[PDB]
């Protein structure tokens, strides 16, 4: 369907990140925990990464800090 640029959601909680993803039409997410300096629970980034233009039916992986 339509394509859309993936928002930057670095630093957001998974709850918040998904709501902002939804605003762009993205609803399908996978998740993986990664070690990071960010507080546990915060998104460190996504795959595809922020700024990528993809179809809104794309699955977006949220990489999530576990500290």
UniProtKB/Swiss-Prot annotation:
Entry's localization field: Cell membrane
PTM field: Autophosphorylates.
Induction details: Transcribed at highest levels in early log-phase, decreases as cells grow older.
Domain PASTA: 1-66
Family statement: Belongs to the protein kinase superfamily. Ser/Thr protein kinase family.
Purpose of the protein: A serine/threonine-protein kinase, acts on HupB in vitro. Protein kinase that regulates many aspects of mycobacterial physiology, and is critical for growth in vitro and survival of the pathogen in the host. Is a key component of a signal transduction pathway that regulates cell growth, cell shape and cell division. Also catalyzes the phosphorylation of the core proteasome alpha-subunit (PrcA), and thereby regulates the proteolytic activity of the proteasome.
Assembly with partners or alone: Homodimer.
Annotated protein name in UniProt: Serine/threonine-protein kinase PknB
Organism: Mycobacterium tuberculosis (strain ATCC 25177 / H37Ra)
Gene: pknB
Region of the whole protein represented: 492 to 558 of 626
